[PDB]
mmCIF file of C-alpha atoms and ligand atoms in Angstrom:
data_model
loop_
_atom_site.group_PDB
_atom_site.id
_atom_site.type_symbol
_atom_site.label_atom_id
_atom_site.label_comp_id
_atom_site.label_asym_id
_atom_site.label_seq_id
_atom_site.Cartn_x
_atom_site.Cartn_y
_atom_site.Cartn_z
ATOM 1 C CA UNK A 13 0.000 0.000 0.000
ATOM 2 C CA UNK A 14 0.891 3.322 -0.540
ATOM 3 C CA UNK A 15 0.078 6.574 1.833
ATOM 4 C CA UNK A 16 1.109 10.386 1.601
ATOM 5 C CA UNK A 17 0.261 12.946 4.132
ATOM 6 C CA UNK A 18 0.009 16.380 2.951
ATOM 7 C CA UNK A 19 -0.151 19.358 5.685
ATOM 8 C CA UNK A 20 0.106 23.146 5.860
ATOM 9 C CA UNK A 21 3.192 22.552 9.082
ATOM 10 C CA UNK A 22 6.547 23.756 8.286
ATOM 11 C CA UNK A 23 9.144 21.281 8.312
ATOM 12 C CA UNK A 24 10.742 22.937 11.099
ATOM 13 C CA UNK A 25 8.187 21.764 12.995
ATOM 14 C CA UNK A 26 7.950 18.467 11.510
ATOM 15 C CA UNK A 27 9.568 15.925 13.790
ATOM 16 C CA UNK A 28 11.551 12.330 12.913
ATOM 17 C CA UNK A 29 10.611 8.799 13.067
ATOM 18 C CA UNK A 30 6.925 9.141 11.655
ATOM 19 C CA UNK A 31 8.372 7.466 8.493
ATOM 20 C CA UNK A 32 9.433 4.168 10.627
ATOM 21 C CA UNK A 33 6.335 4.850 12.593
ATOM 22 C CA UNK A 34 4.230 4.883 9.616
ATOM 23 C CA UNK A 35 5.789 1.550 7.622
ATOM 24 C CA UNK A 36 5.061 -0.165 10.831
ATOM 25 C CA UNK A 37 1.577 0.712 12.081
ATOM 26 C CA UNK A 38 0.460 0.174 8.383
ATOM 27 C CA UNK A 39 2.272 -2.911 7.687
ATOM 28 C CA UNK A 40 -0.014 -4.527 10.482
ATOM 29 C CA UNK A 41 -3.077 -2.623 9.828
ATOM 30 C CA UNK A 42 -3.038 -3.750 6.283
ATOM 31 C CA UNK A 43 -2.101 -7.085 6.721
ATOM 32 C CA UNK A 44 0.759 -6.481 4.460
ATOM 33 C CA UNK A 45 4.842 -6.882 4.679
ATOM 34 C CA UNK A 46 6.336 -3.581 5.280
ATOM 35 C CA UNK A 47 8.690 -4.271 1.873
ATOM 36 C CA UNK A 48 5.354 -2.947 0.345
ATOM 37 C CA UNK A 49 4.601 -0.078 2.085
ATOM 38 C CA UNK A 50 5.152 2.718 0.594
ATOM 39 C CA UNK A 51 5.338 6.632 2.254
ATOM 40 C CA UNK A 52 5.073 9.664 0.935
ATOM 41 C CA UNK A 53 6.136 13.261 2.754
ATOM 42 C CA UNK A 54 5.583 16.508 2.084
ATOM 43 C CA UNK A 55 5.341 19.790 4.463
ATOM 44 C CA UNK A 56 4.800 23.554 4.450
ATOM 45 C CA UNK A 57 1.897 23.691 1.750
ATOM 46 C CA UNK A 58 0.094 26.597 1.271
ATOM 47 C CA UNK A 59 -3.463 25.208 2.235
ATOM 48 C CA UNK A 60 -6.448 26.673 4.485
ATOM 49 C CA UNK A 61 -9.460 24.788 6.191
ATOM 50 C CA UNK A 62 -12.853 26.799 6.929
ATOM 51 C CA UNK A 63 -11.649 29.603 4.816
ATOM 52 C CA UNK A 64 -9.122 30.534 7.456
ATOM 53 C CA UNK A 65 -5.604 30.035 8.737
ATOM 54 C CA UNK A 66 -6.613 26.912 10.516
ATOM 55 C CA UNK A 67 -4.451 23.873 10.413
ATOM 56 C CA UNK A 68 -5.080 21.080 8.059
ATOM 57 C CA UNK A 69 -4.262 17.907 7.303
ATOM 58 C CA UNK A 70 -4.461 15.673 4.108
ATOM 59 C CA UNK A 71 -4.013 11.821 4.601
ATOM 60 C CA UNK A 72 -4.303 9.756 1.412
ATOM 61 C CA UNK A 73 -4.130 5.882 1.469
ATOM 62 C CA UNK A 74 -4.004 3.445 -1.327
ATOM 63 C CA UNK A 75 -4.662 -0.420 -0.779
ATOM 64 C CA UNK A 76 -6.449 -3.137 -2.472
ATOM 65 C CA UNK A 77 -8.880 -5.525 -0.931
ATOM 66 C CA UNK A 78 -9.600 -5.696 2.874
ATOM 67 C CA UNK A 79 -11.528 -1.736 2.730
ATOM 68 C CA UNK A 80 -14.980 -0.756 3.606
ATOM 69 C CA UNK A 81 -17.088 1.669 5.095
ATOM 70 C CA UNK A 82 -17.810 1.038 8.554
ATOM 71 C CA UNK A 83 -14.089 -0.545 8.982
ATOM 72 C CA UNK A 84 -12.980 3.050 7.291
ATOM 73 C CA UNK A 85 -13.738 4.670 11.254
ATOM 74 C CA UNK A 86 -11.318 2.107 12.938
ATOM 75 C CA UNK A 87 -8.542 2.433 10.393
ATOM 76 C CA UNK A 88 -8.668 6.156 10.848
ATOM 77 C CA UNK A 89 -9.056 5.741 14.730
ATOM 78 C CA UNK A 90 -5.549 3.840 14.503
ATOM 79 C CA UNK A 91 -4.362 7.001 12.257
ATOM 80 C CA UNK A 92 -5.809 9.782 14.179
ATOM 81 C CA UNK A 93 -3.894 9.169 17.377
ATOM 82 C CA UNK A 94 -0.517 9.598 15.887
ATOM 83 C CA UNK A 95 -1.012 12.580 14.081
ATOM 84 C CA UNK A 96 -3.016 14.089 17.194
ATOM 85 C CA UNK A 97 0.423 12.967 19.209
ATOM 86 C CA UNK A 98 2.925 14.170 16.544
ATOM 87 C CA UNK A 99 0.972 17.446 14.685
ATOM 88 C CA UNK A 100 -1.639 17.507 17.133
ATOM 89 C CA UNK A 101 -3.935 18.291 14.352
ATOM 90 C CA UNK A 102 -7.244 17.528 15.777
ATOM 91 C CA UNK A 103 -8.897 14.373 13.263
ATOM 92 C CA UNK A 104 -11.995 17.193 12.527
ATOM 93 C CA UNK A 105 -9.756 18.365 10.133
ATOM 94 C CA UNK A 106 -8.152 15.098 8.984
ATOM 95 C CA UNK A 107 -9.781 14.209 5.432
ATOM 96 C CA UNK A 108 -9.128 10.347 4.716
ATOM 97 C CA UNK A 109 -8.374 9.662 0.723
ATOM 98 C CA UNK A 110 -8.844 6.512 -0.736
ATOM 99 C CA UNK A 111 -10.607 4.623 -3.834
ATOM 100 C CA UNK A 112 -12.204 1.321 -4.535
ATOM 101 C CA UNK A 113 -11.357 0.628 -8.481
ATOM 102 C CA UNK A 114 -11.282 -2.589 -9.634
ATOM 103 C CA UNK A 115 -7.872 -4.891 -9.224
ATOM 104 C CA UNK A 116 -7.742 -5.359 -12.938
ATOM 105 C CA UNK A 117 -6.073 -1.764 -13.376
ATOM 106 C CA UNK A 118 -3.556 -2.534 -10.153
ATOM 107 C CA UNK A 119 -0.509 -3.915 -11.119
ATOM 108 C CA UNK A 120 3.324 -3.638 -10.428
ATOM 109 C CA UNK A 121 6.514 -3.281 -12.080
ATOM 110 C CA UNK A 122 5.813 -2.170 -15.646
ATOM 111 C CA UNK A 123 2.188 -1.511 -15.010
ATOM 112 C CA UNK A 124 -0.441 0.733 -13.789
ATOM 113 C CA UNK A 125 -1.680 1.112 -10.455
ATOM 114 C CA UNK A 126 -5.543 2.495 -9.487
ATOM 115 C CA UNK B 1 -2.408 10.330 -5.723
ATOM 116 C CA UNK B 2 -3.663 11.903 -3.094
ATOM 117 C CA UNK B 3 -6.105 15.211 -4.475
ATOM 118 C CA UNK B 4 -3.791 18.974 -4.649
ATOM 119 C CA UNK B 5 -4.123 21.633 -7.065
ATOM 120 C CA UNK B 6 -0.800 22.993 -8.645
ATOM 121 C CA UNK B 7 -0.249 25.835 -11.503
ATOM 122 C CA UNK B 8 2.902 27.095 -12.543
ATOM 123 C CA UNK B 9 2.113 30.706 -11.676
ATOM 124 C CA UNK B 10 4.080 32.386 -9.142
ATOM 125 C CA UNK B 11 3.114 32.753 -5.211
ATOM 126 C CA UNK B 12 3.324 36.570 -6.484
ATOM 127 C CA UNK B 13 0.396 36.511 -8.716
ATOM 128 C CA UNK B 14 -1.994 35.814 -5.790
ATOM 129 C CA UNK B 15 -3.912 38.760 -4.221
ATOM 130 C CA UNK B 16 -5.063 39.244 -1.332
ATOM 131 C CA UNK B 17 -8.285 38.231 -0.304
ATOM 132 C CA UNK B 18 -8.402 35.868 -2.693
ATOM 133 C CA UNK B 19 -8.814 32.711 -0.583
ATOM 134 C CA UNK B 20 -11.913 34.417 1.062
ATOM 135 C CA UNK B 21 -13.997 35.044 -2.722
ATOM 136 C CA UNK B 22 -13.064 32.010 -3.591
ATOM 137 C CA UNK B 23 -14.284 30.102 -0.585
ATOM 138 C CA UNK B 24 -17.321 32.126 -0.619
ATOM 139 C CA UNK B 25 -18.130 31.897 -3.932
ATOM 140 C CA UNK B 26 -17.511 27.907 -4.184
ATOM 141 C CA UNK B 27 -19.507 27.894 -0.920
ATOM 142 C CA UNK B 28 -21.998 29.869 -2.343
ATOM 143 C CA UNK B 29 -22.311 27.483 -5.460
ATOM 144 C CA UNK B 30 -22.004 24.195 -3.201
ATOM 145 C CA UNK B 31 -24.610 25.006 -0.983
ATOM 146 C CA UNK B 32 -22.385 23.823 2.007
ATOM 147 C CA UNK B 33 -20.767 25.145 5.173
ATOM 148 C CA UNK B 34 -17.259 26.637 4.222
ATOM 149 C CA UNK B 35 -16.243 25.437 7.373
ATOM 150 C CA UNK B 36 -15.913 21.996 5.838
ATOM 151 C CA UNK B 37 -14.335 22.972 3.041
ATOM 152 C CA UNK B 38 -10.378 23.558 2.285
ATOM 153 C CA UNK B 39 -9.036 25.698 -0.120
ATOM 154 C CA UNK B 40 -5.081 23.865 -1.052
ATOM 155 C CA UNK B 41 -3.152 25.495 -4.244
ATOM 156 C CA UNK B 42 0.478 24.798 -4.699
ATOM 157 C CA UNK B 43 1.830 27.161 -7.577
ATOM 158 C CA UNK B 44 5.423 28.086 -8.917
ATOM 159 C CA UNK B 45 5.516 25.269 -10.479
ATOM 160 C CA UNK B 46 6.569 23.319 -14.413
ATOM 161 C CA UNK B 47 3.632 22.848 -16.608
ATOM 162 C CA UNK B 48 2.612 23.284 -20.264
ATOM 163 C CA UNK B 49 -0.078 22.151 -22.763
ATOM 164 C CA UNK B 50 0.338 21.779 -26.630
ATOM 165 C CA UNK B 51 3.917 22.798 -26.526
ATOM 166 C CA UNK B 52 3.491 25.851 -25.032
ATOM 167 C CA UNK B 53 5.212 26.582 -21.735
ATOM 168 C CA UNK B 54 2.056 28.973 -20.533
ATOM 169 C CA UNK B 55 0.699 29.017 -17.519
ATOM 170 C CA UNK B 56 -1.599 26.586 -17.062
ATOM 171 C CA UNK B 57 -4.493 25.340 -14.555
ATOM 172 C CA UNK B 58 -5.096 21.804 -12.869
ATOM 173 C CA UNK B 59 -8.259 21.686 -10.298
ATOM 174 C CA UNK B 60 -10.041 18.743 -8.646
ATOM 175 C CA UNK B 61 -13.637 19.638 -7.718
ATOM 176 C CA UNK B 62 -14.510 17.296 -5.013
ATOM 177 C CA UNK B 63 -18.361 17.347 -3.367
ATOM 178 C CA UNK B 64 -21.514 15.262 -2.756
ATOM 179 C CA UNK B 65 -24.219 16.128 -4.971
ATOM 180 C CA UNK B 66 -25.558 18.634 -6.758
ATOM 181 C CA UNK B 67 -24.279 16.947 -10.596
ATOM 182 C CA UNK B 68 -26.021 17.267 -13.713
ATOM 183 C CA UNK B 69 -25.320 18.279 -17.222
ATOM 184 C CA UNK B 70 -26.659 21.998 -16.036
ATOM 185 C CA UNK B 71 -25.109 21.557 -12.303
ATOM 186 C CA UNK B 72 -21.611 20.930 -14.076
ATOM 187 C CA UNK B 73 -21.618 23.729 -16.347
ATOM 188 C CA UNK B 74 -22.138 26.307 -13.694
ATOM 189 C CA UNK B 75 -19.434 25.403 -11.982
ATOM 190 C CA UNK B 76 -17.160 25.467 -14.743
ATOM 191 C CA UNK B 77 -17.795 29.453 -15.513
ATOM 192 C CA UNK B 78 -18.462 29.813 -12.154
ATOM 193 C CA UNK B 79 -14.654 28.582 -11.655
ATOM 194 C CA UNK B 80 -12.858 29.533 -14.745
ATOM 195 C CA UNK B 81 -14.398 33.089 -14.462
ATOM 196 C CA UNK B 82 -13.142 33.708 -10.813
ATOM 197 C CA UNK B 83 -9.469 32.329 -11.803
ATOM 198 C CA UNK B 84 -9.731 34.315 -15.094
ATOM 199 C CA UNK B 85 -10.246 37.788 -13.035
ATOM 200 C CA UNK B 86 -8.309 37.010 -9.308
ATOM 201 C CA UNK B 87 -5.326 34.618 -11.078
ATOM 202 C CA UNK B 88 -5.714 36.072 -14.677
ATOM 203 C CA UNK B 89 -5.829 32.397 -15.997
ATOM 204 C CA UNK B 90 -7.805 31.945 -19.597
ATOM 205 C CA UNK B 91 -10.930 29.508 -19.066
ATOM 206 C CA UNK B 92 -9.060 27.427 -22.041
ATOM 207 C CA UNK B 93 -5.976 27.176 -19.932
ATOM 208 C CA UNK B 94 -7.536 24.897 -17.069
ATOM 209 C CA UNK B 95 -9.028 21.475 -16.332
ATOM 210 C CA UNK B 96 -11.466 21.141 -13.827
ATOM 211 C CA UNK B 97 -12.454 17.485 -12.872
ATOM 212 C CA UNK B 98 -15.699 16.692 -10.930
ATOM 213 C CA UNK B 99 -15.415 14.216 -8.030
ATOM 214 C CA UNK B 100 -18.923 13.264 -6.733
ATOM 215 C CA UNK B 101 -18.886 11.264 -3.082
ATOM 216 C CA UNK B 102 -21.632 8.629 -1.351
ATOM 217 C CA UNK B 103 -23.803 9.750 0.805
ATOM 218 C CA UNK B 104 -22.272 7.824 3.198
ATOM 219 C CA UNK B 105 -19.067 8.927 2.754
ATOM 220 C CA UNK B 106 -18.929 11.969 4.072
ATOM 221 C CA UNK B 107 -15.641 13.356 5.604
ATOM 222 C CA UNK B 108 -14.415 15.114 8.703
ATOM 223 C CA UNK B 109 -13.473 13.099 11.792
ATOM 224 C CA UNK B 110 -12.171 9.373 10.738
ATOM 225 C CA UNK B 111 -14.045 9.621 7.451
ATOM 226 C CA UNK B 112 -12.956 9.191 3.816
ATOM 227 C CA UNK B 113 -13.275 11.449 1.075
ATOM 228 C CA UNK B 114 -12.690 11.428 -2.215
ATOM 229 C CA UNK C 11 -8.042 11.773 -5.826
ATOM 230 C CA UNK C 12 -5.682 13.592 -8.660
ATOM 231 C CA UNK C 13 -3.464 13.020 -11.290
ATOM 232 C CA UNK C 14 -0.230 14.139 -9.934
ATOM 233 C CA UNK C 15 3.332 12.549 -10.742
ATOM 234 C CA UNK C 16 5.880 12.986 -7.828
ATOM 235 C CA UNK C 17 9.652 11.664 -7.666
ATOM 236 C CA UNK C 18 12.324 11.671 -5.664
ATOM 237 C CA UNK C 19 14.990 13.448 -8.312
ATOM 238 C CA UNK C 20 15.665 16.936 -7.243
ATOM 239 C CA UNK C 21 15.355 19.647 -10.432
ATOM 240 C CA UNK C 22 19.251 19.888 -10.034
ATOM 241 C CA UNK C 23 18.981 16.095 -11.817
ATOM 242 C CA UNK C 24 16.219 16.892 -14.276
ATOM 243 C CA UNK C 25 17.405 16.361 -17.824
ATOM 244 C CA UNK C 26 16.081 18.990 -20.916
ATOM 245 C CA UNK C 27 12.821 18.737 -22.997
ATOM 246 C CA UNK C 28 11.030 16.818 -19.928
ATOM 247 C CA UNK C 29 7.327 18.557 -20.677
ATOM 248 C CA UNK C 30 8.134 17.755 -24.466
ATOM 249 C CA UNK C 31 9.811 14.391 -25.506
ATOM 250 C CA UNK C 32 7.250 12.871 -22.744
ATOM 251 C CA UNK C 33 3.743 14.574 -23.934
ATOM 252 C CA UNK C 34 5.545 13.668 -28.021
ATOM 253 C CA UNK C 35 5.719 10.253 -26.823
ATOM 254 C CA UNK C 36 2.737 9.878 -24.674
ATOM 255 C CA UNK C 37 1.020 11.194 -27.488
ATOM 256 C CA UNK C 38 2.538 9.072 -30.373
ATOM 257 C CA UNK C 39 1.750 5.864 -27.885
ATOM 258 C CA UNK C 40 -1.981 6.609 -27.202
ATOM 259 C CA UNK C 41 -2.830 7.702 -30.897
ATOM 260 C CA UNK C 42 -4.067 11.263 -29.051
ATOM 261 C CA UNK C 43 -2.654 14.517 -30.171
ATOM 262 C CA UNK C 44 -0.009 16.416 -27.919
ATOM 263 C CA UNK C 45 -2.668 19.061 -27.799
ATOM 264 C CA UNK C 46 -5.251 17.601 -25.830
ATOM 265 C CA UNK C 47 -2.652 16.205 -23.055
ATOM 266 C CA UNK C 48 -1.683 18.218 -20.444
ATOM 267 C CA UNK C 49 1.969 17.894 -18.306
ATOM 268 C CA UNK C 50 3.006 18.785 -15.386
ATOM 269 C CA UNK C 51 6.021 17.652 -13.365
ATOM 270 C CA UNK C 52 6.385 17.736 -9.468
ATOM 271 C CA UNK C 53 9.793 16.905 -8.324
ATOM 272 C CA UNK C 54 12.656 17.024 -5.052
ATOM 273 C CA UNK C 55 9.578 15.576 -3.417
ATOM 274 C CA UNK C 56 10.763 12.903 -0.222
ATOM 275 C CA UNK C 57 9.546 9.365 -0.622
ATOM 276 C CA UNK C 58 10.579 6.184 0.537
ATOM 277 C CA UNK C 59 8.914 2.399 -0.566
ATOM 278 C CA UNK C 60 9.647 -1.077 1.591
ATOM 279 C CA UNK C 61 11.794 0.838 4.189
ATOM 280 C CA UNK C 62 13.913 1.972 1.578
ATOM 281 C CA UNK C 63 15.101 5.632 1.539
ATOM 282 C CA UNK C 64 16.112 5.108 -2.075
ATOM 283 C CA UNK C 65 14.732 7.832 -5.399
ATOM 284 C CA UNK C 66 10.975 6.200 -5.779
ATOM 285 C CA UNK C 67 8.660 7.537 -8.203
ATOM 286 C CA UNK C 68 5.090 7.584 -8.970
ATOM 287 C CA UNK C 69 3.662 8.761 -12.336
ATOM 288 C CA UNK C 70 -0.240 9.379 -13.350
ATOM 289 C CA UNK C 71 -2.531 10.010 -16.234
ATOM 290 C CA UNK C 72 -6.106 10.195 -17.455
ATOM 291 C CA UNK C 73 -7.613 9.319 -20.297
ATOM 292 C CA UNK C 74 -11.602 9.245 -21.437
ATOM 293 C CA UNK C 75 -12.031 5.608 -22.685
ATOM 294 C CA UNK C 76 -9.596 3.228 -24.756
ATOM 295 C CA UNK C 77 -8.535 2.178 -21.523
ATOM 296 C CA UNK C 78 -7.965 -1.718 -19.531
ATOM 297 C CA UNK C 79 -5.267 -4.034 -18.878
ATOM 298 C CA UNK C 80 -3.759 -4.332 -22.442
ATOM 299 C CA UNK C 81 -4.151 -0.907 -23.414
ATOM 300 C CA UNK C 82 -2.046 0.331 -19.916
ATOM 301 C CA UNK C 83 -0.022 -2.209 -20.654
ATOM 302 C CA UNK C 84 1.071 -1.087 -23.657
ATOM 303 C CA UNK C 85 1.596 2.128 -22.567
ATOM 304 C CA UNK C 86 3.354 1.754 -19.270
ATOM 305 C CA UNK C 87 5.764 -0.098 -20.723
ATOM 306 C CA UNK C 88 7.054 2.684 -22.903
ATOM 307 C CA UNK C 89 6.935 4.786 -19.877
ATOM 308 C CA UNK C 90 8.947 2.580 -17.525
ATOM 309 C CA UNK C 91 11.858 2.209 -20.365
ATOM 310 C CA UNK C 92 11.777 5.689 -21.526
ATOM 311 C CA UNK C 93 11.673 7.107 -17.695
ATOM 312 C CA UNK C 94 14.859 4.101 -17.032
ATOM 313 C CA UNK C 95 16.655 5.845 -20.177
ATOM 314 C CA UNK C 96 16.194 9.023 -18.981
ATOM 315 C CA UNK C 97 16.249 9.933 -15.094
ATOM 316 C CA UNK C 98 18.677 7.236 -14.604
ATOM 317 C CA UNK C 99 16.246 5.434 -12.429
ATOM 318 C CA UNK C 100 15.309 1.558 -11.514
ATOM 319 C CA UNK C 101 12.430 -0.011 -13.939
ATOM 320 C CA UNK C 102 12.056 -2.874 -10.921
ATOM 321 C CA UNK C 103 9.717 -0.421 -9.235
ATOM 322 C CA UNK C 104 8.361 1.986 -12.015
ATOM 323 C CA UNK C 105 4.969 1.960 -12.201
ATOM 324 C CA UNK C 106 2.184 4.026 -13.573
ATOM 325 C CA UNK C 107 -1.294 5.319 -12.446
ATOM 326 C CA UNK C 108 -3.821 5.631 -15.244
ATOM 327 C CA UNK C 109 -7.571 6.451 -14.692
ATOM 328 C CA UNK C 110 -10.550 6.667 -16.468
ATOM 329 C CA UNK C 111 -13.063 9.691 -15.876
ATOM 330 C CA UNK C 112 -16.626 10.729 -17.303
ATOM 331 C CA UNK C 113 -17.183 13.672 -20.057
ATOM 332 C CA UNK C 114 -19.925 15.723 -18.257
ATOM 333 C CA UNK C 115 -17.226 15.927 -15.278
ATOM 334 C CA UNK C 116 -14.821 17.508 -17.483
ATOM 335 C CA UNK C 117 -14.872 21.049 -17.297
ATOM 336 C CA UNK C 118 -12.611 23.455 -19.618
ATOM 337 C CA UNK C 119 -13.016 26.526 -21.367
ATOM 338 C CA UNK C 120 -15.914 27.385 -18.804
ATOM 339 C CA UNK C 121 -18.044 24.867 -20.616
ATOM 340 C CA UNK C 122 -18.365 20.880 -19.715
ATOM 341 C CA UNK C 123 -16.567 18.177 -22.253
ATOM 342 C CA UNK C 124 -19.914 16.525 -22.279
HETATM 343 C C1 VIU D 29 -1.519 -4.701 -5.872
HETATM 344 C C2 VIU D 29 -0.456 -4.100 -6.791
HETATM 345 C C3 VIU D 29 0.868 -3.911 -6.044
HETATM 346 C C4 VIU D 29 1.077 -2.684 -5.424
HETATM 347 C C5 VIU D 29 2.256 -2.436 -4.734
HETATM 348 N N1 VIU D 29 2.451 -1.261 -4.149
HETATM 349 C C6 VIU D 29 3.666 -0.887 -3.403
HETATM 350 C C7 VIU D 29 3.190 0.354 -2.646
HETATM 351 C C8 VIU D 29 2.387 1.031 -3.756
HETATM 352 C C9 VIU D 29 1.494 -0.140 -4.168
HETATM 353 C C10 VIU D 29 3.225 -3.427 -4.657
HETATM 354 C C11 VIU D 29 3.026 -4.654 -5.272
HETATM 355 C C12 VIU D 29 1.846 -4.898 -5.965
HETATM 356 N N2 VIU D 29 1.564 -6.112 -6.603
HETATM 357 C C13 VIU D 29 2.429 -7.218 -6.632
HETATM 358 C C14 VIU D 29 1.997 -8.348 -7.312
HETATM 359 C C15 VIU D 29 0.627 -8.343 -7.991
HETATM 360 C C16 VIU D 29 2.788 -9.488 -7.367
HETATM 361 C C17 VIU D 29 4.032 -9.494 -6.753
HETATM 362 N N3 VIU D 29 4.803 -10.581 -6.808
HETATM 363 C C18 VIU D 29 6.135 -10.693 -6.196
HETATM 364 C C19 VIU D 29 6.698 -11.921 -6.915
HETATM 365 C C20 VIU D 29 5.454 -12.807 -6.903
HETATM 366 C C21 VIU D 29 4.443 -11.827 -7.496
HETATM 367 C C22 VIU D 29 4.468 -8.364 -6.075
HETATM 368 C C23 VIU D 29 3.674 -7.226 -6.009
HETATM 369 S S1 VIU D 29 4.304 -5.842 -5.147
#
């Protein structure tokens, strides 16, 4: 699987470890090897929630099978904590992407994913 | 991917007050609280289209409801018209790409989004 | 979600004609005309896949119809070689990430496509 978590915080005060943290916590939530995990950075974006300078932040996951949406609550209860702990962005503005496209356009090496 | 809107126009283009119009406006249109909405733009960036190096215009327009043939269209000169007079971007210049959402998946607090 | 390509290669690695040999290509390979295809390019962007701190990349595209296994196939193949040939970069891990979208949610030139 593949996640990205895009947030208007400087790097400055972007801490270490979330990476490791990250490869981890997903690796068991998906039920996949960490060798497929796949993370994606990037701070200081110029974005604004509620039409004001309130803090935001954008967490986009991509995995196949194993999704739905009652289960979506728990997977985001798992996520919510650490970025309440590390950003302490309150989850109210934490906006969970993700898609459900058929396997038959997810492939690897030399192929496309969904 | 995750959902962001990039342009290669310069930071310095942007006026001010323009996140406030355009969050009112798309609010306006929407029909929902702009409290649980985000406005994200990343520009000063590489793009092109045709050959030509101009600046261009890439936006996602993700809601719930509210699409139709008619609906769509609104939005588009409703959009392009804003960007053409607060950006100075020609309507023939940018893509906009409708994202419609279930009903029952609606965002904010452990909740995916498209 | 949104069609965005991200990589690990800083623009101090970028070769020349990146927004032009690509789109020619792209172009040549679908049968579409360089024209109607837009490109943008988002690099020095931090990414790591299986643990590994090492350059990833992830590209993207849409397309309205012609589209399925074959077809992506046949396309992301010329991608992964020409993107190997190019930005000095691994074709174990290249991938691509095509999707499919629907006319009346194409808006440009403050009309709809449909
Ligand atoms: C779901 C798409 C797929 C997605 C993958 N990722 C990595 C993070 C972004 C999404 C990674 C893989 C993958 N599919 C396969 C498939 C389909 C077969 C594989 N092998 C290893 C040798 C035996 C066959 C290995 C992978 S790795």
């Amino acid at each position: 699987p593949m996640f990205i978590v895009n947030t208007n915080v400087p790097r400055a005060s972007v801490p270490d470890g979330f990476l490791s943290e990250l490869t981890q916590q997903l690796a068991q939530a998906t039920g996949k090897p960490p060798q497929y995990i796949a993370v994606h950075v990037v701070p200081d974006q110029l974005m604004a929630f509620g039409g004001s300078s309130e803090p935001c932040a954008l967490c986009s996951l991509h995995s196949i099978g194993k999704i739905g949406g009652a289960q979506n609550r728990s997977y985001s209860k798992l996520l919510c904590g650490l970025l309440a702990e590390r950003l302490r962005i309150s989850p109210d503005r934490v906006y969970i992407n993700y898609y459900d496209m058929n396997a038959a356009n997810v492939g690897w090496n030399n192929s496309t994913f969904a």
